[PDB]
Amino acid sequence: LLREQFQNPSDEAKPWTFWYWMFGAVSKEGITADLEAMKRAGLGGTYLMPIKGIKEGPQYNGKAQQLTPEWWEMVRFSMEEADRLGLKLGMHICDGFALAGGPWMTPKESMQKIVWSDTIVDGGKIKGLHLPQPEAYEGFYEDISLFALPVKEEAADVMPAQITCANIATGNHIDIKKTVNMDDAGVIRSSYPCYIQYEYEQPFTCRNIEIILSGNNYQAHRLKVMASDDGVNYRLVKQLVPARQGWQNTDENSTHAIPATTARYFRFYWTPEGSEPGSEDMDAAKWKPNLKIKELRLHREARLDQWEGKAGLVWRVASSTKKEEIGEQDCYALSQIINLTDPFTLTATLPKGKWKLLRMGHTATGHTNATAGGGKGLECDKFNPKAVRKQFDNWFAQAFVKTNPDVARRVLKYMHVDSWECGSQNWSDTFAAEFRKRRGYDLMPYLPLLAGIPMESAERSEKILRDVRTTIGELVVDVFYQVLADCAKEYDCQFSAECVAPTMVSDGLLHYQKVDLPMGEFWLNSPTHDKPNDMLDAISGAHIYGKNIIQAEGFTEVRGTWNEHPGILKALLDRNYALGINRLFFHVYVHNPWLDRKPGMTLDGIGLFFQRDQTWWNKGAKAFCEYITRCQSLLQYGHPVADIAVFTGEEMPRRSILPERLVPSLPGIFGAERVESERIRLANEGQPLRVRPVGVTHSANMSDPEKWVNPLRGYAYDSFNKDALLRLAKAENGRMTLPGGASYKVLVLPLPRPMNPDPAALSPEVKQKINELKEAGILIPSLPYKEDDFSSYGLERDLIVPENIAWTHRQGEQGDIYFIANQLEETRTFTASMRIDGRKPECWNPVTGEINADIPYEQKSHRTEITLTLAPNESVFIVYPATGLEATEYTVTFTANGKTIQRQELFDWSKEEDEQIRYYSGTAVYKTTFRWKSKVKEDQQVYLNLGKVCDLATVRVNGIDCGTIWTAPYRADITAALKKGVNELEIEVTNTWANALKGADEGKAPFDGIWTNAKYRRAENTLLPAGLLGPLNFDVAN
Ligand SMILES: [Ca+2]
Ligand SMILES: [Ca+2]
Ligand SMILES: [Ca+2]
């Protein structure tokens, strides 16, 4: 029964935590303390991940370096204690955060890329010639093919230029030292509009510009290229366009093609005007709009525009190359190219003329699991099933050998793969063969496409490179994820996994079919580091592949500042429940090995600081986890409901679509106010900056997922890929269905968009299936869709609520559940109208566990309406079956320093003259008495309203616990504990660490033993309000 699950949830409904061990500083005492604390809070289990080692933190004197017998003994003891407590465990597939590295991996077994060298020679007889050696990572390299290409032009690929620059920004509020300048190493920097001029002694013919950076720089890709023959009259060549790119974009330079231009002068104009705000697929645009260029290389030889991404070396999307940039004369036909692989030093003969000797091979990409300690080394080849198996055998499998095997088999039941951060790869020893099987033709004659050298035509070159990227994405799934899935099943473990996008070339949804537990990620107060697109990848992936439990790495905080408590985490959690997550994992519980240092070890101040030495752990983490468990009990029930599927298209790479990107496709669904807010945000006038958190300056108009609650105004959608369309979709009763309960009425085929700008042509099999779905009744709306909703087609909104109300809907055999959550810090009363006809709603309170089965409701036009009142950040589930306190003198006892005071009136601890109270962080126990005049009458209900609580409070009346109050409304039901006459009142109030850390920083610690490696602090330098501020009142109801 649903009631029993809500009231007595199963262990599958409990939240979990990530558990990090820092710098090999680990103790058994701390292990016991941590795991008991986890059990006390109501956590179901933990993912044990050690982070860095003794070298990275020698000051901590760590005794548990990864893979030492001492470390293995800590792991064994952890399994022993989890077993004793009834907790389960997971581990990651490598040391550190990610991804699949270890000291057992050689360069040959690591991720591979196509590399090359080249040299121009006279044709005729060639004997004993030593060719240049391509890039060889740690000296590993293997030849594949040697081509000879007849030169298009005998002139040199680059020439000497004199480089100069000029500020063009004319005004009076310009810092002259930030205007364009070139340093002694030639690095170009600017904060203001400028140009950079290249002058050649003789006219130079340029066909592309290779942009070389030190780290990422969005602005560098926005140069406007101009040229002159005479030194004053300049003509437009091209406005350069930034390719879509993720944060891991430094492995390759960026080649921007232009129409072939012959000139003595080239000017590269720059202005920050027109800049797009930052996002996950224009990651560099998150940062200050300054220009910084290491080098511009102006090349003569023809290359495909943005070929480095198109070759699969790095995760990028750019438009196909225009014919005006690469025409037929710029391409090689296969007949022109002489294959010298056999004879190759080189000895053979060639027709007269000049030949480019293109020596192609492969080497390691150069990536490690760099956040590891003892387990650090090269990332495994993601296309080599033997290397993937080897990774599994040497870390995860050893947890069942080197510990206690029978205990390990009982408690270590989860195998985790985290979010990818090992770059991309476009080769392996089996890649040619896999390409041949999957794409239906041989890649090998076309291998120079992987260096961006065009063949046959631009269109043909880019059709083949798309096929290369497609193959890459398929091998991630069919090798890496398939092998690990087999391994997990072999070891009786559930497989959880985070995203592959936006660092490894992929269809970002595709791998979720191979795992048990798709896992998203959401950050707290960290706009520059949040991954809303990762969340939608994991949720869409789970929905379309029928994975019912959707995990989420939650609350990661780029700079924790010690003022965080559950009360300010609720709204954030709720909007991610609305997206579709149903098992939270706290990021992060750090192991604090010292029992006499608080709050102790952290991930160098990266939050959330969710651990035993939190001021609010014992009561606050427990109360929050109780709320979480009740929510998850219902949010794991049945199947999620979503009316709309949105096709993710045929470009590579690809992934789920953020709501903002569908606004031009569905302007009527989003509404006019959203259309207008997006116009302004994307215009991004003045490129404004914001600082959030302290010390992190970024693009103020960056999309913020807090502002995208219920963006379709009463419908939900999943992103939906080619795989799911062709392999899984069926039409039943006019809806598109998928195994595991997905059922969509609408299939949106979006307009061309930043991640699919061409757009990539629909394959015959996709057009056929679309038409089949169309004839069977699935709605394929014509775009842009301008009506408010789909009611004209018989598809009404699921839930009609006002703005800033987050929701989701699930359904199964026992009925329908709507989660409804207030995202504002205010009390609201509003109508909620649900697409449910003729059933009786109930209001189930997840904070308290109370069920109100007799709520008023109206039945209008075959919907059901209720009037809800929600306190700040309050949420509720709607389920459809199938007077002044007059206190005596307070005694207040500050538990952490034993100080006791007597006060008549309530007070803010932070305004006290006594420094040990002023800077106090921890718990204080308030004791008083109050008179209650009457016997409590039948059906009468009495609440003690607490007024303002800084930050949480546990109420006891005559010794009876009346609740831990942590979120609005700030009241406890004291009905059952009240007696006529004198009543005893005890309230335990707990704040956050911020005030005591400030005090300790200034030589005014309110007690002994305060220490943390977390050094970030609020910029404001204020003490936070602290304590039971009140006023206290009774609310007597019926
Ligand atoms: Ca992670
Ligand atoms: Ca499309
Ligand atoms: Ca897009």
Q: Which of 100, 109, 118 has its CA nearest to residue 138?
A: 109
Classify residue 348 as exposed, middle or buried by CB count within 10 Å of its CB (0-12, 13-18, 19+).
Answer: middle
Identity of residue 999 = G
User: Do the beta carbons of residue 111 and residue 69 sit within 8 Å?
Assistant: no
Rounded distance from Cα 480 to ligand 3 centre (Å): 27
* Interatomic CA distance for residues 972 and 978, integer angstroms: 12
Considering every ligand atom shown, identify the ligand nearest to the alpha carbon of residue 760 and give its number. Answer: 2
User: Do the beta carbons of residue 876 and residue 870 sit within 8 Å?
Assistant: yes
Query: Which pairing describes strands 235-239 and 295-299: parallel, antiparallel, or unpaired?
Result: unpaired
Rounded distance from Cα 219 to ligand 3 centre (Å): 20
Angle among Cα 500, 504, 506 to the nearest 5 degrees reads: 70
Rounded distance from Cα 365 to ligand 1 centre (Å): 22
Query: Which pairing describes strands 583-590 and 551-556: parallel, antiparallel, or unpaired?
Result: parallel
* Interatomic CA distance for residues 13 and 202, integer angstroms: 73
Rounded distance from Cα 764 to ligand 2 centre (Å): 13
Question: Residues near 406 by Cβ (< 8 Å), separated by ≥ 6?
Answer: none
* Interatomic CA distance for residues 292 and 187, integer angstroms: 7
* Interatomic CA distance for residues 445 and 284, integer angstroms: 36
* Interatomic CA distance for residues 854 and 840, integer angstroms: 8
Rounded distance from Cα 646 to ligand 2 centre (Å): 9
Strand ranges, E, within 557-708: 583-590, 598-600, 639-640, 644-647, 689-691, 697-699
Rounded distance from Cα 553 to ligand 1 centre (Å): 7
- C-alpha radius of gyration, the chain, whole number: 32
* Interatomic CA distance for residues 169 and 190, integer angstroms: 11
* Interatomic CA distance for residues 612 and 17, integer angstroms: 12
Rounded distance from Cα 753 to ligand 2 centre (Å): 9
Considering every ligand atom shown, identify the ligand nearest to the alpha carbon of residue 49 and give its number. Answer: 1
Question: Residues near 688 by Cβ (< 8 Å), separated by ≥ 6?
Answer: 699, 700, 701
Question: Residues near 408 by Cβ (< 8 Å), separated by ≥ 6?
Answer: 79, 399, 400
DSSP 828-897: EEEEEEES--S---EEE-TTT--EE-----EEETTEEEEEEEE-TT-EEEEEEE--B----PEEEEETTT
Alpha-carbon dihedral 266, 269, 270, 271, rounded to 10 degrees: 180
The residues that bridge with 428 in the sheet, in sequence order, are none
Query: Which pairing describes strands 1027-1030 and 948-950: parallel, antiparallel, or unpaired?
Result: antiparallel
Neighbours of 144 (CB within 10 A): 18
Rounded distance from Cα 521 to ligand 1 centre (Å): 8
Question: Residues near 702 by Cβ (< 8 Å), separated by ≥ 6?
Answer: 277, 278, 279, 286, 527, 528
User: Do the beta carbons of residue 268 and residue 199 sit within 8 Å?
Assistant: no
Rounded distance from Cα 420 to ligand 3 centre (Å): 20
Rounded distance from Cα 731 to ligand 3 centre (Å): 27
Classified as helix, coil or strand, 340 is coil
Rounded distance from Cα 515 to ligand 1 centre (Å): 16
Identity of residue 818 = Y
* Interatomic CA distance for residues 94 and 746, integer angstroms: 41
Distances (CA, A) of 317 to 632, 656, 755: 37, 14, 6
* Interatomic CA distance for residues 632 and 637, integer angstroms: 8
Rounded distance from Cα 446 to ligand 2 centre (Å): 27
Rounded distance from Cα 517 to ligand 1 centre (Å): 14
Rounded distance from Cα 756 to ligand 3 centre (Å): 6
Q: How was this structure determined?
A: X-ray
* Interatomic CA distance for residues 985 and 978, integer angstroms: 10
Task: Sort residue 714 into left (φ over 0), alpha (ψ -120 to 50) or beta.
Answer: left
Identity of residue 833 = S
* Interatomic CA distance for residues 862 and 796, integer angstroms: 11
Domain spanning 799-881: CATH superfamily:
Golgi alpha-mannosidase II (2.60.40.1180)
Q: Which two tokens stand for residue 836?
A: 């449910």
Rounded distance from Cα 659 to ligand 3 centre (Å): 9
* Interatomic CA distance for residues 562 and 1001, integer angstroms: 13
User: Do the beta carbons of residue 716 and residue 644 sit within 8 Å?
Assistant: yes
Classified as helix, coil or strand, 526 is coil
Rounded distance from Cα 244 to ligand 3 centre (Å): 9
Q: Which of 847, 624, 635, 631 has its CA nearest to residue 41?
A: 624
Considering every ligand atom shown, identify the ligand nearest to the alpha carbon of residue 758 and give its number. Answer: 2
Q: Which of 875, 865, 741 has its CA nearest to residue 813?
A: 741
Considering every ligand atom shown, identify the ligand nearest to the alpha carbon of residue 554 and give its number. Answer: 1
* Interatomic CA distance for residues 349 and 848, integer angstroms: 86
Considering every ligand atom shown, identify the ligand nearest to the alpha carbon of residue 780 and give its number. Answer: 2
Rounded distance from Cα 1008 to ligand 3 centre (Å): 54
Rounded distance from Cα 720 to ligand 3 centre (Å): 14
CA 857 vs. chain centroid, Å, equals 40
Considering every ligand atom shown, identify the ligand nearest to the alpha carbon of residue 646 and give its number. Answer: 2
Rounded distance from Cα 277 to ligand 3 centre (Å): 14
Considering every ligand atom shown, identify the ligand nearest to the alpha carbon of residue 654 and give its number. Answer: 3
Angle among Cα 892, 893, 894 to the nearest 5 degrees reads: 120
Q: Which residues of 612-628 are buried (b: 16+ CB within 10 A; e: fewer)?
A: bbbbbbbbbbbbbbbbb
CA 555 vs. chain centroid, Å, equals 11
Ligand 2 is an ion; residues with CB less than 5 A from it: 649
Task: Sort residue 947 into left (φ over 0), alpha (ψ -120 to 50) or beta.
Answer: left
Classified as helix, coil or strand, 400 is helix
Rounded distance from Cα 276 to ligand 1 centre (Å): 28
Expressed in Å, this structure's resolution amounts to 1.9
Considering every ligand atom shown, identify the ligand nearest to the alpha carbon of residue 662 and give its number. Answer: 3
Considering every ligand atom shown, identify the ligand nearest to the alpha carbon of residue 244 and give its number. Answer: 3
Rounded distance from Cα 597 to ligand 1 centre (Å): 27
Residue whose tokens read 């036909």: 333
Instruction: Estimate the crossing angle of helix 69-85 against helix 28-41, to 10 degrees.
Output: 30
Q: Which of 804, 843, 811 has its CA nearest to residue 826?
A: 804
Ligand 1 is an ion; residues with CB less than 5 A from it: 418
Question: Residues near 478 by Cβ (< 8 Å), separated by ≥ 6?
Answer: none
Distances (CA, A) of 919 to 602, 619, 661, 894: 22, 21, 47, 12
Q: Which residues precede chain breaks (C–N over 2.5 Å) in the chain?
A: 344, 882
User: Do the beta carbons of residue 222 and residue 240 sit within 8 Å?
Assistant: yes
Considering every ligand atom shown, identify the ligand nearest to the alpha carbon of residue 748 and give its number. Answer: 2
Task: Sort residue 365 into left (φ over 0), alpha (ψ -120 to 50) or beta.
Answer: alpha
Rounded distance from Cα 443 to ligand 2 centre (Å): 26
Rounded distance from Cα 49 to ligand 1 centre (Å): 10
Q: Which of 322, 301, 491, 319 has its CA nearest to residue 392?
A: 491
Q: How many CA atoms lie within 13 A of 881 on its CB side?
A: 6
Rounded distance from Cα 93 to ligand 1 centre (Å): 12
Q: Let me know if domain 890-1037 sits in CATH 2.60.120.260.
A: yes
Q: Which of 39, 188, 108 has its CA nearest to residue 362?
A: 108
Considering every ligand atom shown, identify the ligand nearest to the alpha carbon of residue 317 and give its number. Answer: 3
User: Do the beta carbons of residue 454 and residue 304 sit within 8 Å?
Assistant: yes
Q: Which of 9, 993, 134 has its CA nearest to residue 583?
A: 9
> Which H or E run contains 675?
helix 672-683
Query: Which pairing describes strands 815-822 and 875-881: parallel, antiparallel, or unpaired?
Result: antiparallel
User: Do the beta carbons of residue 453 and residue 529 sit within 8 Å?
Assistant: no
Q: Measure the N-to-C terminal CA separation of the chain; round to a whole number of Å.
A: 29
* Interatomic CA distance for residues 974 and 983, integer angstroms: 11
Q: How many CA atoms lie within 13 A of 608 on its CB side?
A: 29
Q: Supply the CATH classification number for the domain 162-301.
A: 2.60.120.260
Rounded distance from Cα 246 to ligand 3 centre (Å): 13
Rounded distance from Cα 460 to ligand 2 centre (Å): 20
User: Do the beta carbons of residue 875 and residue 848 sit within 8 Å?
Assistant: no
Rounded distance from Cα 930 to ligand 1 centre (Å): 50
